[PDB]
Every structure is written in C-alpha cells, then in structure tokens.
Design a protein around this ligand. Structure first.
Ligand SMILES: CC[C@H]1OC(=O)[C@H](C)[C@@H](O[C@H]2C[C@@](C)(OC)[C@@H](O)[C@H](C)O2)[C@H](C)[C@@H](O[C@@H]2O[C@H](C)C[C@H](N(C)C)[C@H]2O)[C@](C)(O)C[C@@H](C)C(=O)[C@H](C)[C@@H](O)[C@]1(C)O
Lengths: 50, 7, 96, 64, 79
RNA sequence: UUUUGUAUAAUGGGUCAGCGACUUAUAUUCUGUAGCAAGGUUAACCGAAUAGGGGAGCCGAAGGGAAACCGAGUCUUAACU
RNA sequence: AGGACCGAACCGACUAAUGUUGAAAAAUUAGCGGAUGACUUGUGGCUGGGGGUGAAAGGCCAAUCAAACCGGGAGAUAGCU
RNA sequence: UGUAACGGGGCUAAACCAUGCACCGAAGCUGCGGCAGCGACGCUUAUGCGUUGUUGGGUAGGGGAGCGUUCUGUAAGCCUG
RNA sequence: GUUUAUUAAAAACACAGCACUGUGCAAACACGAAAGUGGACGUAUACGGUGUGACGCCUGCCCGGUGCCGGAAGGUUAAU
RNA sequence: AAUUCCUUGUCGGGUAAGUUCCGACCUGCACGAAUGGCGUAAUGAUGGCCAGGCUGUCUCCACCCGAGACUCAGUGAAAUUGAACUCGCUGUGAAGAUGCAGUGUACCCGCGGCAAGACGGAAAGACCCCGUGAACCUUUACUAUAGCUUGACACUGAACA
RNA sequence: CUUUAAUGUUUGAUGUUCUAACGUUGACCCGUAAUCCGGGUUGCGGACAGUGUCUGGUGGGUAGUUUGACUGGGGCGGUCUCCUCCUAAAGAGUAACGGAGGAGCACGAAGGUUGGCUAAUCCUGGUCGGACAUCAGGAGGUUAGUGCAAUGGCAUAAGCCAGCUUGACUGCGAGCGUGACGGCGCGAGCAGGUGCGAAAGCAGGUCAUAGUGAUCCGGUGGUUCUGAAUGGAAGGGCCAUC
C-alpha cells in the first residue's frame, strides 16, 4: 500500500546512509534531518528523500 | 474379481 | 540433516565462508620445538627438516607455547611479544 | 568409502574450541529497512548452535 | 459461519513474585496491556515500552498498594 | 499377527522333515580394553616376508577472527565499565 | 439377369436347456442365419511391439494385449502388508 | 427362535431399614523354606560368608550374563571296533 | 453384409448415394535417418483426406470465438 | 420422442381392469435440419404393443419309457483343513457364539435325503478411501521434441541496369 | 581536401540476361542382351531448387511429468499466515469444519521534549434554533477520547493544544522473558555525538499486543580484508541495502 522506501545519504562525503519510508504521494518535498554519522562520529545533515 | 457384480 | 519436510537448519541459516588459502601455507611453532631443530639456528625451513612444519609452508610464528632453554637464534620468522621475551631471556637471539 | 561432508553445512558452521559450532544469524540478508536497528544490531555477531541441533550438524560434518 | 482463528500464546503475567531472588534485572511481571494492572515503583522501575515491569537493582520483589484510589505497584526491596 | 481392544464369526498355518531373514567392506564417532604418552602411529613399498626397514603422512600439544593478522589471548568498536 | 427365392454340403453363431472338479480352458442337443457371393476353402508368401493389422470392438498379433513373448539393466523402487 | 428384566433352584425373609458380633473370601498381609540385585552391620578384604533392611508384573525398547551348534589352534594330545 | 475368437450381432461398423477439401505428377499423402517403395506402370470423369449415409421432400439464421483461405501496406520481432 | 425431470401429464382407443402400446395435444425440464430434419415400399435370428391358432407355460399336477441317483463286484479322484471329545435356548462378549454364563435337552454308530448355520469353499476387493503408487487416454496444463515453416551464412558464379 | 550530385571502384536491395557450379523420376550412346548405378552426348531447369550449421514461428504428431493438505468417508464448499476475546477449569499452556471480530497498515508528526489544558450526558436560561449547532450556569465525574479490531490500560493523563525539535541516533549490553529449533521480545547501564528543559530530567520511534517471508541466486554503495608466478584487475568476504 502506497508508502515507499527511501535512502538517507550523509551530507558528509562518506558513503553512510540511514534507511526508512515515506508517503511519496502526499509529501513530495525531500525529507532532510540531522542524524549521527558514525564514520566521522558527528551529527550531520542527511538529504535525499524521493 | 471380474467387476461383474451389483455395485 | 533431514528433519521432515521442514526447511533444515543447515539451510535456514546463511552461508558466511571465505577461505584464506594463504593461511594454508602458514604454520605455527611452539617454544617446545626449536630445541629439537638440530643446529641452534631455527630457520625459515630447518624446522621443516625437523618435521615440525611441512614443506609447503612459507610462513611461521613462534608463539608463547612455553618452555625454551638452550639459547637459540631465530631467523626469518615472526615471533610474539611473549615468545621474543622468552627466547631472549634464555640467551636467544631474534634477527629478522 | 569415506563419508562425504554434507557440503552445504560446511559452508554455514565452523567447529569452535571446546567443540561447539557457531553460525551466522538468519534474518539479516534482505528486507532490512523495516527492522529495528537494535534487532539488526544483535544479529551481526555469530552465535553457537543450540543444544538441540548439535545432533544434526555433527551428522552433517563428520570431518569438522 | 466464518468463525475460527485466534492469536498465539503471548504469555503475559507475573514471572517473579513475593520475596524472590530477583536478580539484577529480571522481567518480573510481563502482563503488558498494562501500566496499570501493575505499576513501577521502588528500586524497580523501567516499565518498558510493552509496559513490562522489571527489576532495576538486585533484591526481593514486593507488591504494595497506594493512594490514587488503590493501584498496585511492584517494587524491589534491597535485600 | 495386527490392534483402543480379539475365543473371536478378523490374518496366517492340513501335517512332518530339511532349508528360510540384521550380513560384508570401507569411513566416522562413542564405550570397553590394550600399548605408549606431550606425544601417538605409520601408508604404499622394501623385505632375512606376521619380524626388520620405510614417519610420505595423519591425530594431538593454541586459540580467536570471514580474512590480512594477532596470539594465551583474540574478535567486536574510535574505545571498551 | 440377381451381394434374387426355398433348401443339404460348406460358412456362420440369434434362443433355450445341459454342462460349470466338463466329454470340452466355450462344447453337446433342439431350434436359428447365410448358402453364385463384400461367399467359402488348401498350400505358400508379406506386414513386428508405441509397431503391425483392424467393414472399428481397444478387435486380433500363437489359450497372453489400453502396448506381445524371451533374455538383460535387476537384488528397479515399495514412507505399504 | 424358548421360560428369558434375581445366573438358576427357590425365597414372605433367603426382601428392605437400623444396630451389633461372627465367619467365608485374593497371587494383598503374615508365617516356613529358597533364589537374585542394591544397601548398610558384623565375620573377613587377587573376597566370600553370616545376618539384616529393601527391591524383583511388563509390550515398544535400553542394559547385563549365558547355553548349544559348525569350523582353527591347543591336538602326532585325549576318547574310540 | 461386418463386429467385441471366449457374457454385447444391435439402433454399432460398412455400404452404394451425397458434400466439402486437398492433390498438375518427381502429385497430395504414407513407410523410410537415406537410398528407395507404395499412391500408379494411374493423371483431375484421377487420387488422398473428412463428414453424411438407398430413395422421397428438403437442408433456414449467425464468421463475434476457435480453425482454415486470401492479403507486396504499416506496427512488433530471431540468428546475423 | 432411443430426447419429457415434474410423469402413471392430459384427451381419445383397445381391456372386466392397461405405469406399456396405438392416436393426439404442445407446457420441447433439455427436437431441428449432412456430429443431417421429416417421410418411406422392401428387407431384419432388431425394440415395444395386439389378436387367431396352439398348447403341462399356468390352475395343479398324474402316469409312463429311457439315462443317473440306490445295492454287489473291479478300479479309484477333488477342493478344504490351527487342533477337536464339533447340541438347543436366553444372555455376555472385538458389538450376529458348537466352544463364555445360565439353563434346557440328548444312549453309541451308519445309510439315503435336504441346504437354515459353520459370518460355508473358491480370487491378499474392483466399488470406498489411502500411497508425495502404475499405466494408457485428453487438452488453450508444464517442459521438451519429430514434422511443417521462416530468414542468415556455406556449397555459390558472371554480366548489364 | 563537400550537401545541392555523378565518373572509377571495394559493398548491399530489387529487375533483366548468361552458363559454368547444382537439379533433371526428357532423349539418345557405351559399359551391357541390364527400367539398378556410372560414364558420355544433349534438351530442360539454373545460381533457383536442394542440403549442412545457425535461427524466429508452428507443433498432443510424439515423449516425460505435475495436477496440495485439512475433512466427523471422499467430492463440491470452506479453510491454510498474523492480532483480539471467549471455550480455557482465578500462574503459564491447552482441541474441535466450536462461538465472535480484526491484520498484510498509517504517521517526518500522528515521533522527541517542554509549557499548558480536561471529557460524555442530562437539567435550567438564552435571537434566528428545532430532540440534537454556538453561549451561560448547574449537575455528572470519564459513562468521552485513543489513527483501525478486541482486550487490558490511561488524569502525573498514554486523552486535548502549542513552542522548539530529529533520540525513528552509531557502537555495546549486566540481567531476563519466550520458543524443539531457526527465531522473537523486554532491558537498566557504559562509550561517542544530539535534541528539549532554568534545572532535576526525559528521548535508542508511536498507550501496548496485528501491519508479515527463512535460505539460495543476484543488484547497488562502502571497505587495502582476499587477489592462483609478481603488480594490478576479475571474482570472493565483510558492512549497509534492495
Ligand atoms: C463357471 C466357473 C467359474 O465360476 C464363475 O465364474 C461364477 C459364476 C463366478 O460368478 C460370476 C457371476 C456373478 C453373478 O457372481 C455370482 C458375478 O457377480 C461374479 C462377479 O462373477 C464366481 C462366483 C466369482 O466369484 C464372485 O466374485 C465376486 C467378486 C464376489 C463373490 N462373493 C462376494 C460371494 C464371488 O463369489 C469368481 C470371482 O469368478 C470366483 C473366482 C474364485 C474364480 O475366478 C473362479 C475360478 C470362477 O471363475 C469359476 C468358479 O471357475
């Protein structure tokens, strides 16, 4: 049912990425939020969100 | 048895 | 392995192998050896000749597996922190 | 003739020191994004085959 | 017509009780569907996400009752 | 014999005699027993042929890790209370 | 003249009884059909097994046929008795 | 199918209620003798005695100990016209 | 007329007659790795296949489906 | 109706009486035109119905002649069979008893007769289901495949447009 | 050192012509008194036809196979995993083709924190206004609400509203619960970094219990861990994910 899976890439150049889902249909603006990147061990902005 | 019977 | 038609343990669980192949040609040496090397020089092979390694081997550590007495010089091998200490403390010498 | 190791099992267990066997957890190969980090986290480190399955594994790996 | 069906086991219920060994952090009382049939208290609290009541430090389990009209409260008496 | 259960009206046998069904080989593990012991044992083969020789090799004395590697530790992690 | 008529030989096999450890692994007796025809018969030939042959029934292919018989794979396999 | 709804005879108590004392009755309990396993205690320990307490139904099945048959040695022995 | 030799002789099969369809001959078609042979020492008034079944009076509507015949356009499409 | 379930439909005929039959109706559960429709002389060991004759088919069986059955002599089978000292009844019971309980009855043994019982004999059910059974048959089941068919390259060349 | 165009080429498509591969189950000749074959001459056909390899189509003509289980016989029907109540006998657990209902999600706020707030229903009064809109007081005291079934919870609210936010964080995990097992669940605390709060604090998703899929094969990103002489690379492993 509708809600699709998204990747969340670290804005640091590291390849790290969290993973989750969102409603592609109702909220098209690309989700971003501060999350902990563990290869640099700093809280950093994560972009990509459909 | 057969068959003849039855049945 | 068959456990009724149920998916068997050795199939429910994932594979995780990867075989070193380099490991296959590395031996490990106990302190208890070397005294039996015959010639006070414990060499790249030599151990090999004392039948404590096996021809194909190309690498070897010396490992604190206890008990070395006769002073011995080990050459071309690797040797643990504890083994070096035991060798040296028995009048031994560890040249690369 | 020599027994043949049940080759599939050979690629999923390794005899340990005291004679145990250790394996990789299931449930960690795909459809992951929906699983708690805590759960997935606990599924990384290998674990011992239970007492109940020992019988099976050994019969699969006579030359373990 | 079209009946059958049922949830599984699920368990739920006191698992430690009274004076109990109550080691370090036992899940003494798992009747979730709770924060209610039982309540966090003394040297035990936690009260996990599925309302499980569990030891927070070693000792004996208790079971009391208090002043917001009744209410049960499980707690751990240091031994 | 088979069965929850058989005098069963459920199976099998007319009777006697002879024959008639858990073996053999090779692997592996456990118990007993024997040898020796941090060592134990040789395979083919030689052979004065059950001896003697042959230690190629196999098992064990070190483990941990997918692995490099490290080693009475090691793996996990930047790091472990 | 006639796959014409009545009717023996000859060829068939509609009914009945008998027979059913038979006289006979399909007959005997009394009746019955065809009887110059797509008739009937002696001898010899050809067609072979997923193949033959079949005015067609799955009929027949040596008392065997929804895949002949003999030998082989062979101690097929049998979670059944 | 034939009395066929105390098992029968038969019963007016040989039926029913209460109280009580008898007795019959089992491979249960006890007594006498005996075997075997496990205990302990005493005689006495390459043990076996004596007590003594106790245990000994049994299918699938697990464990233990044995009889006898064929054949090799022991055996050019031993038995045997 | 034929048939289930041995529980079915019939309304079943066959039949002459009818129709469709294939086949131009080195025929279609069948047996056959192939050579070859049958079809036939025949040739469309012939031959194979299929359905129907003497004769009499007749055989209506539907080509959307499936099949077959025809279709030098275009769309999609194999090795290469 | 070789098609009609309802159905012995309804009407007419034949019979003392007719679920069949003959003739009709049409409400054709669910005829129909070459997997031919409706007719049809003749033919049929073809199906259904009727009548005359005929009769032991029947009422209802009698007698007779022959072949067995029975007796003697000779020869001499068969299937089946745990073992038999192998009764009735009512009851019990792996639930339909010669064999258990209770009870009744019954001297021992043939021969000729009869089939109610020995869940009689005979074939390790075919129907019923079951087996991760078999085989043949079907198809727009699956995967292949002979055949048919398509193009490319080879055998395979030259011209001119 | 050309498109609006054309002479020499190496090269496809189509159409005519030729003979010389190839066909000839036309004729004649010889082997040869021979309807086989071969050679020969010749007519016909002719780079077609046919055949080999490759290839798309068709292919019950032929072959091998599959065609589930439960089940108050079997078939037909229904059912097959997950959550909730009862049956269930006051710990857990507990069957039937027993009785009733849900699920295969939703939410970047519907999550975190901080501050604040408190319902249903009825009586009385009140323009349009009624049995039931909004206001007022009073009863009542959660009979309301909860993102969805049912149960158990919830006022310190888990219910209602708002500000700031990303803790729906990475590595770990004393100790527990629950499973034959694979597995699933709960968890204080430690380390790093973060949010809200004056602060004590709280936060490792949501009031909780459904919202799901083993392994294999493979994709992607990362990763000096491996790299079949050596350096690389392929491939593999590991971490993340499909
Ligand atoms: C002539 C000679 C043959 O007799 C007949 O054919 C009679 C006339 C059969 O009945 C015929 C006629 C008839 C009506 O059976 C009476 C018919 O139903 C059966 C199928 O075949 C018999 C009896 C059949 O039995 C019956 O088979 C049935 C499956 C079950 C029945 N039983 C339950 C009692 C059983 O007795 C059956 C199988 O032939 C008996 C088996 C052992 C045989 O094969 C034997 C060798 C017979 O062929 C035979 C005696 O030689």
């Amino acid at each position: 049912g509708i809600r699709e899976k998204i990747k969340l890439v670290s804005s640091a150049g590291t390849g790290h990425f969290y993973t989750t889902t969102k409603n592609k249909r109702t909220k098209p603006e690309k989700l971003e939020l501060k999350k902990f990147d563990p290869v640099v061990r700093q809280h950093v902005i994560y972009k990509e969100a459909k | 048895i057969f068959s003849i019977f039855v049945i | 392995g068959f456990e009724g038609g149920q998916m068997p343990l050795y199939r429910r669980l994932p594979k995780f192998g990867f075989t070193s192949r380099k490991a296959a040609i590395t031996a490990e040496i106990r302190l208890s050896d070397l005294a039996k090397v015959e010639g006070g020089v414990v060499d790249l092979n030599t151990l090999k000749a004392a039948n404590i390694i096996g021809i194909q081997i190309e690498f070897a550590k010396v490992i604190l597996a206890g008990e070395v007495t006769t002073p011995v010089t080990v050459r071309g091998l690797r040797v643990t922190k504890g083994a070096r200490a035991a060798i040296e403390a028995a009048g031994g010498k560890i040249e690369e | 003739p020599k027994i043949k190791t049940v080759r599939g099992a050979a690629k999923r267990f390794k005899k340990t020191g005291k004679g145990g066997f250790k394996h990789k957890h299931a449930n960690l190969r795909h459809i992951l994004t929906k699983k708690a980090t805590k759960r997935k986290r606990h599924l990384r480190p290998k674990a011992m085959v239970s007492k109940g399955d020992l019988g099976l594994v050994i019969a699969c790996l006579p030359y373990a | 017509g079209g009946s059958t069906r049922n949830g599984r086991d699920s368990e739920a219920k006191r698992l430690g009780v009274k004076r109990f060994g109550g080691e370090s952090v036992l899940a003494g009382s798992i009747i979730v569907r709770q924060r209610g049939t039982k309540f966090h208290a003394g040297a035990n609290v936690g009260c996990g996400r599925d309302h499980t009541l569990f030891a927070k430090a070693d000792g004996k389990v208790k079971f009391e009752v208090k002043g917001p009209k009744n209410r049960k409260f499980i707690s751990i008496e240091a031994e």
